[PDB]
Subunit: 480 residues, 3 copies
Amino acid sequence: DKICIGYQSTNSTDTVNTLIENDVPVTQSKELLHQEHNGLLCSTNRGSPMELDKCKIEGIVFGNPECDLLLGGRDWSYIIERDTAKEGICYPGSIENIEELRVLFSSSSSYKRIVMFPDFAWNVTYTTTSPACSNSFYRNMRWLTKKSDNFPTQEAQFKNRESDPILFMWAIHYPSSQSEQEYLYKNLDTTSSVSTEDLHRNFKSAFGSNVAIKGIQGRMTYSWGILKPNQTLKIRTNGNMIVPWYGHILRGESHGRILRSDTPLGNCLVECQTERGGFNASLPFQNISKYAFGNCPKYVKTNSLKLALGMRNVPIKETFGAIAGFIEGGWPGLVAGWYGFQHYNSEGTGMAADLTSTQKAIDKITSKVNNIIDKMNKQYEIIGHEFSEIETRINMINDKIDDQIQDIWAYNAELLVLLENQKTLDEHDSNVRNLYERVKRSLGENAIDEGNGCFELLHKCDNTCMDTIKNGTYSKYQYS
Amino acid sequence: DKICIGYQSTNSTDTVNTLIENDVPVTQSKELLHQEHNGLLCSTNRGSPMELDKCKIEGIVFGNPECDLLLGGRDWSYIIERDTAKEGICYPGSIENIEELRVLFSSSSSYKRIVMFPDFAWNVTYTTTSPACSNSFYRNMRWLTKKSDNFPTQEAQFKNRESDPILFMWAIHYPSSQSEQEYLYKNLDTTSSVSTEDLHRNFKSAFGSNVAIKGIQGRMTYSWGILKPNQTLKIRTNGNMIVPWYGHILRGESHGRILRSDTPLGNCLVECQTERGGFNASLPFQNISKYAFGNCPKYVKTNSLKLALGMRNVPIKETFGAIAGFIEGGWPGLVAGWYGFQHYNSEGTGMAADLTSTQKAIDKITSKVNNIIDKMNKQYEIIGHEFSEIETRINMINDKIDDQIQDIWAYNAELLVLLENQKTLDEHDSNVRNLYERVKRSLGENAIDEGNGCFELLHKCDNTCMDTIKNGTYSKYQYS
Amino acid sequence: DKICIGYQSTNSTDTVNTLIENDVPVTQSKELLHQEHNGLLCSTNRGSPMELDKCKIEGIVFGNPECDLLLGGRDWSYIIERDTAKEGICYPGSIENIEELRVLFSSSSSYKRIVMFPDFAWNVTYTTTSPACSNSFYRNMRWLTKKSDNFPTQEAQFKNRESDPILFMWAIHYPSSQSEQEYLYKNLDTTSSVSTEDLHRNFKSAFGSNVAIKGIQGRMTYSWGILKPNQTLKIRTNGNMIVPWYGHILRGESHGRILRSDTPLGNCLVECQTERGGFNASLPFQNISKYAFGNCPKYVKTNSLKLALGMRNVPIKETFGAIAGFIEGGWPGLVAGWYGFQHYNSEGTGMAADLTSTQKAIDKITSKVNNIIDKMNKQYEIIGHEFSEIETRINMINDKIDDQIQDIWAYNAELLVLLENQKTLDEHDSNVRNLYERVKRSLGENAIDEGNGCFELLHKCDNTCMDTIKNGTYSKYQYS
């Protein structure tokens, strides 16, 4: 009569790699690399996007007449700019610090548009429009020009009596010629000034031809500022100035999440949003995109990070089948557990799982997986940024951060999986060996350690004796 | 007669976590996370701080009259700005590149103030003061205004004949009105120029009202520069210029350490200084602050990084107490060592530590701890930086570096402690098993391996024979 | 008769460190830290350098007359500036955004110089030269001055009809005095304008003295721009402007690789190029330089990263020599393999390697080394950057990235080598123990496990029986 200690072999096709071996068959494995997304742009935990289908961010900021105003309590956590959004500034010119302005507007926790300089309080003409601007003009500024061939110096003030800062906008106009300068502002040499308690800026007139844009040869330089609570904004000009009209109240701003994308919008909530799609993921790594916002696994460019869970899955080589245990390989027949017993006595042969050692092993492998997954922080995000033509150095520095961080995570995740897989396979060997040593102690000198998982019993052992050996109540000292 | 191999069990309450198990009792452990600070702002190895109680950095730079001059050989390695330090620039205006200027002044290895343009060599009035500036004016510049209703062009030069570069300061004044412009400089349109071999800057006059600051409606724009050794600075103006007077000699500058803090100053030396307090630490990690200067462990936000040193601390379950060794658990009675022997013979029972295997194990655990601690570099620091309103992109990029580095260290330190704890417990099991196998070999066929740490001796073994077994001189071949 | 299981001991002097032990002798080891370079500046996989022996980058950009023009199909992947390259701009002044300009020119995949404003199409004088510029003038711009005591407004246009963007250059001149202003441009107050569809820039005249540079007291401010395909550049001026003449066609630009170095140029191809020399390397780490371009191992400042390959190299202590195996140490005589047998019978004694277990062990150690080496990514580079005097914050941030990344790699590489060395030595112990257990099973009860690698055979075993034991065909059940 014999009793043998073995472990499960299964129909699984899974293989993994380890630090020391390639393509080892295993009975169970777990992917650590999240690989799927829902092909949509969704809400995150921080909020919902603002989709812009015909207007650029700065079109909304300055109030391009082809753009809708924003709803008076809207919030958004990121901005989507479709390839059809082409309405930015409409009158030919340039925006100062456009990248910083777009970042500033890229998020809001509760939007409000506030009037700052009522258009009827100006003493000159304030109604001018332009064909470049849909035969209208901007909705957040007013173009001042001469009235009755005169342009006395205008001066007006506004105090921020709100609880949050206000983003405000203005521009300086440079006509295409001296006659255009006279026609619009009468005075040939003008001075415009913007000031607060924190800043003072002076602008002097100029005119002359420029490269024609849709027929127009004058130019505007667009500027912007932030008026903090209780500060006062003074506007002064005797020509060439497009003055503020309405400001935007800034609440929860400058998160920077801007996405130029054609991916369809959806009605969905997601932990992690990328340009090509969003997803929920408990895994610590992902191969979907280097840029993502929300609560995001670290990005790793590779196809798989497969962790071994179960054991080496090579059965004992069938060639009648002799009798052996764990030393020769696994048992294709073992069912209810990872490790178990096969016995041979005069009532026949049988095979039963050992639930204790199996559950101990499962708890250990489960806490290993949970530690590898749970220790990963998911607070910070890596997002795409915009840089101007004279910002290639900071562009390179930004990319260097993203790339060096990626190299660290790729190497550490690959090596961690390889090292842990080696350990896990060795741990299963240790577990089944420890089951075998327990029985050895329990059987004492009543059995010869063939040792190949198998024990030759020096006395007959029927099914009841076999059960006592399995459930650990067999006494090696018994007399019957 | 029996001899048994076991290991220590103690009254310790320590637990640790391992990759595969939670809250394992251990007999000894070591914190890797430094958690204490002295609640004070101290000196570091680089030097001592400069505490500023009423003046801002730029107040000292331009020489606000409410500020003391600096001592002529002072050094400092960082700057402390208390919440009462409100004297920066006193005449209403703006400093160009203020963040860069404050960084430049944030450290000095040996300070000196040097005169560059003696105030009496100007041919116009150079004495003007202002109520905004304590009815005085700046101590490092001079306000030039008309003399006898006249302002001929002034022009003067200064060569840096020192061995180090000089920081110098100037400003341009924009009066509140045309009449103020005439009253101060006579000429309505003025030109001011600053030049060196490396730079040339031109400034034209302007005037007009601004938002009133403490009643004043004119404004100044403050500027600064660095004159390198042997270079020459030429100053030219016919109005609107506040000219340099004294410069600061720059030695060991631009370290960037600036602290806005109410933490009390102390008379202490420290390796690592944070806003809330400093500390000495041999440990590689710390949870005190993300920003610190000096020689600093890496920052990890968590409560504990507990490394196991001793062994699993579960004693053999008392239930008379039978006889077993290391296979069943630890011995609460073992005292002078980690591993040892318990013997049973006709003269009685006894328990003695094995010093050899204990010292080998101690050396291994000690070198593991020292490698984990000593390989950590402590040269570089992560410090808080100041950014302007149009610098949110580089602000975000800077924060991304700090945050991604933190995520790497947190994950690697947590996992390293978990992996090493697993290994250390297994290593203690291996050590005591190896002691047991040595005795087994030495006893040879004179003993039955009960194997549970215990050996049943096939011959009587008195205290002297027991001692020979312990100190390895027992011969399994002996005839007596 | 006896048969013993042992492992190789050799004449090797190699030691390594492990997490738990110092200066362990080993029979074979491998450096992971690349330490050699060829003392030359070479080509990389991206291309060959441009060596500049007398001209600075910006000398080539603006066309300093002492510089050769570039060949019309030249490419370069980085720039070398020798300490003799002193010809940058020749007429005294300053370049706007000089760091960004030098980065932009630092690489090209196929160069071309293109004429944009033929010098003979100007209606004023366009030929002026200066002693500061070798009694010539720049080759890529033209100095416009008055003709017949007159300077009517010039205006000209150029469209980019190429497939790539064009870098173009211009400057504004500020004479040393009003009489110089009249002599050069007649008009006392001039206006110059540069414009494209994307930009408009206006420049007004000024004059006055400056610090004299090689006798000259006027100054130039140099500017530059990028005209994209199909855009139009309009140039307008009535004085003080140095106008574009030739532009540079930008193909594969802004890689940033600039090297100020005296290292000799060579005719060599290299994976990784540093300032002091280049090298090919399969290893994942290098200690040659923190800055390098190409495909580069991570930089680690330390002398050695020695990985153990073979086994603990302590032979059994010779003291006649008794009989033992792997438990006591290694065999200085074992030759053809790592693990083997020593036998003792009536025909004599012998020693033979076991090729199976040796090859299995070699495959495992080899895949460990290859995984540690091959998982390292070598796409990204860390290079030195240039920063201006008001860019110390981004300078510090850049250095922080480089330094924090270095701290991570140094700690992880040191600890990885220590941990793997511990494991590798333990793995060799396991391998030889597993060989010993195989023979034990094969010999069954025909041998007493002395266990010290040695088996005492309970029957005579001649050379043929010994060979059957070695090649695994010995039957413990045999009857002869």
